[PDB]
Ligand binder design. Sequence first.
Ligand SMILES: CCCCCCCCCO[C@@H]1O[C@H](CO)[C@@H](O)[C@H](O)[C@H]1O
Ligand SMILES: CCCCCCCCCO[C@@H]1O[C@H](CO)[C@@H](O)[C@H](O)[C@H]1O
Ligand SMILES: CCCCCCCCCO[C@@H]1O[C@H](CO)[C@@H](O)[C@H](O)[C@H]1O
Ligand SMILES: CCCCCCCCCO[C@@H]1O[C@H](CO)[C@@H](O)[C@H](O)[C@H]1O
Ligand SMILES: *C/C=C(C)/C=C\C=C(C)\C=C\C1=C(C)CCCC1(C)C
Ligand SMILES: *C/C=C(C)/C=C\C=C(C)\C=C\C1=C(C)CCCC1(C)C
Ligand SMILES: *C/C=C(C)/C=C\C=C(C)\C=C\C1=C(C)CCCC1(C)C
Lengths: 259, 261, 260
Amino acid sequence: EVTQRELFEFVLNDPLLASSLYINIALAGLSILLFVFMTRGLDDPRAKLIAVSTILVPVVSIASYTGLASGLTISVLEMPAGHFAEGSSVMLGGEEVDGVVTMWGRYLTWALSTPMILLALGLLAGSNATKLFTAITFDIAMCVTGLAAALTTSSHLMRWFWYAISCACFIVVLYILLVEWAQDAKAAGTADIFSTLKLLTVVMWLGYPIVWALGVEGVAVLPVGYTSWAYSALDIVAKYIFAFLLLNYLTSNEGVVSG
Amino acid sequence: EVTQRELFEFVLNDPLLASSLYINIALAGLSILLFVFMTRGLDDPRAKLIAVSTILVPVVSIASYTGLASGLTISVLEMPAGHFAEGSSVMLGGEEVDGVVTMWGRYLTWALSTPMILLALGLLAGSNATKLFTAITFDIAMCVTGLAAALTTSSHLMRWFWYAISCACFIVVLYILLVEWAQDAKAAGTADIFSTLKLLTVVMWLGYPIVWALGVEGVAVLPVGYTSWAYSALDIVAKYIFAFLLLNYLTSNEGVVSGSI
Amino acid sequence: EVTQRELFEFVLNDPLLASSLYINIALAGLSILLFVFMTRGLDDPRAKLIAVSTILVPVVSIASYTGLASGLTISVLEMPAGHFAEGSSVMLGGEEVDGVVTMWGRYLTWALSTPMILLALGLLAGSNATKLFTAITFDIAMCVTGLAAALTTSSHLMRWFWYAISCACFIVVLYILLVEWAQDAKAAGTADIFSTLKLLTVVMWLGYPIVWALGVEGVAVLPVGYTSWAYSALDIVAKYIFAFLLLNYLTSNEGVVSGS
Ligand SMILES: CCCCCCCCCO[C@@H]1O[C@H](CO)[C@@H](O)[C@H](O)[C@H]1O
Ligand SMILES: CCCCCCCCCO[C@@H]1O[C@H](CO)[C@@H](O)[C@H](O)[C@H]1O
Ligand SMILES: CCCCCCCCCO[C@@H]1O[C@H](CO)[C@@H](O)[C@H](O)[C@H]1O
Ligand SMILES: CCCCCCCCCO[C@@H]1O[C@H](CO)[C@@H](O)[C@H](O)[C@H]1O
Ligand SMILES: *C/C=C(C)/C=C\C=C(C)\C=C\C1=C(C)CCCC1(C)C
Ligand SMILES: *C/C=C(C)/C=C\C=C(C)\C=C\C1=C(C)CCCC1(C)C
Ligand SMILES: *C/C=C(C)/C=C\C=C(C)\C=C\C1=C(C)CCCC1(C)C
């Protein structure tokens, strides 16, 4: 029964964690600023919907990373027998504690920012509501089952079963990104930029389940701090730059996306 | 105290709970396979929305039932004074623990599946946005106030007050289903199929508060394993069979429900 | 270690607490009954969508306040070093307990009812989906960061920080109300009622961060019971009266908001 203060200090006291969380808190703040600045020239209602859903990305990121930073959304979990990190222990407060410091707050950041990325990207491609619906529902399911995979301590096989369920919902989203919106963007006149934002997205998105698998939640070839910086690095790219790359195209082509 | 692993083992070790939970993970998985295969012939955006909302029913089911099976969404709660299951105990991790194994994750399943059932039925009926909004918001309120009833350990009376508020929300959804979409479907050209599904929905849905009352959450004439099976049997019809029948009509009648959303 | 029953009893047996909470369960219950009555003659789909969104206010209200009254959504929390309530204690379960009774369940009420407030106000003002999306998302973010600020016990600083993030979000909402929807309304033929509801809304809403700062979550000049009543007072006006007034204009101007 560790304290939130204990986790708040454990992080401050760990090189990798402290930096992995605070550098992204910093970059998220510098994004909300650069983006509110970049998008002042917009006036069309649709261009402005794409702008604000995009801007919400770093808004969700700064708040959710603060949840981790404060120790509010981190837990110490004891992994199941057979799990590569079972047996782990951590110095918290004045004692050794069984378990792995688990920053499950990362799934809350993901559950909140991915539907905004899909909404902005969907509108960019001129998607109809059905595909928008399909993408966002399976995306939320993908994130929430991943979180349940992370939170499952009862059994090792059960964790990988959730992982599989999360993979299946990922495939539906990948199909919409790669086969449906790739085609829809042509009617909307956004094919060029879509292929770029889609290529980045699909590449960075595929990275998450690979890291999960090799990182501490999986077979742990990557320690807690490195599992964290890998996720943090992927976030800076899949999120802030993605938002910069999409917003640098938008505030140059307001007419194409209007209506 | 009571660890997630302790509950996962108890479930694997109890005839009614393991079968009531794992059979549904299995049927949900098979339902998804069948429904995807059935619906590959659809092209219309609106038909497809009725199809995806329906498909999300067993997707929500396989995921949330796994929540229960893994032990993640189970709690051991001690019932308040006068509750008919107060003072019960359950043998966990070898030790005796006061409380009733409470599979609260069931409300998470219902909270996620029911709005997908109403969206599909409302689209089937040719519902306007107002009634789609009224049915779904009151239905979600129904589930959450039901979960609240289940998690209340402070007072017996408090539990039944949450139960009554929940029922109030239910009556609003029944009204839309039985009064408004019935009329809407006639105008939409789907009256017959909407009428059969609506009645299958109302019949099975009335089953949940009855089971809640008769079961371990209410007066406990049904112990935990029997309460669990009563809820799992209702889920098989209200979720998987209901969906099979809806998609059977949809994939033979794409033209009637084709249009904007 | 404090139980749910012990928090239901603490509340039940404290004059200020039982009153703040149970008075709002009763008023919401009556608001629902009254509002359903008032709106029984609406026919247009848009007006009905405004009515049901506004009726969801006391429904979210009766259920989330019960959340509080039952102990379900209350947590006794030890404030961090420096907080003006650090070291406080209560006496729950007959024992002296370190911390402050924290009715975090209030943020559930707000997170669930404020979006309904903006949808109904926005639709009244003729808002386009974009500003409605902007007002509701930032509103929800404001409420969740407020809850996080209230649930943070790790350091006094970080708490006031969440409070600030919850302000940057609130500022976005304020720009939409005061400015944008005021402009949108004029044309919707609701400029007049939009001014009255906007005034009440901006005024009452502004108080929440001030009460938070002054109450037990903040510098604690207001103990638990007064903190509860301070927030419960803003709710009674920001919710039930705001709702009555808005429905009163709806029951009278149905034709106006039907659009066509
Ligand atoms: C369709 C869902 C797929 C998940 C299936 C999970 C069932 C695996 C159960 O494993 C067993 O659990 C026992 C109790 O903990 C251990 O003693 C034993 O060593 C372990 O092998
Ligand atoms: C909606 C169906 C009707 C449900 C009615 C539920 C009544 C349950 C009352 O509980 C009892 O209340 C007494 C007085 O508070 C307590 O002394 C006692 O210990 C407690 O067990
Ligand atoms: C729709 C389902 C109806 C639910 C009815 C629930 C009624 C619960 C009755 O419980 C009993 O109440 C007595 C006081 O009235 C207590 O003294 C006694 O200890 C308690 O066991
Ligand atoms: C810590 C979170 C605080 C983030 C604050 C930045 C949010 C910016 C939302 O976009 C702005 O919304 C206004 C209202 O519609 C428009 O008038 C304006 O043109 C548009 O740029
Ligand atoms: C911030 C943006 C993100 C995190 C985008 C995509 C994330 C995924 C595609 C995650 C996939 C996952 C899988 C398939 C298995 C469960 C864990 C998981 C959530 C990392
Ligand atoms: C999976 C589909 C379901 C669960 C459909 C309907 C469920 C209800 C109508 C549940 C109603 C309930 C009531 C009226 C009382 C509180 C508990 C409750 C949520 C089971
Ligand atoms: C019931 C209606 C409500 C609570 C309407 C508005 C509430 C706010 C504007 C609350 C703002 C807050 C801030 C700015 C700081 C954090 C605490 C907070 C949530 C009270």
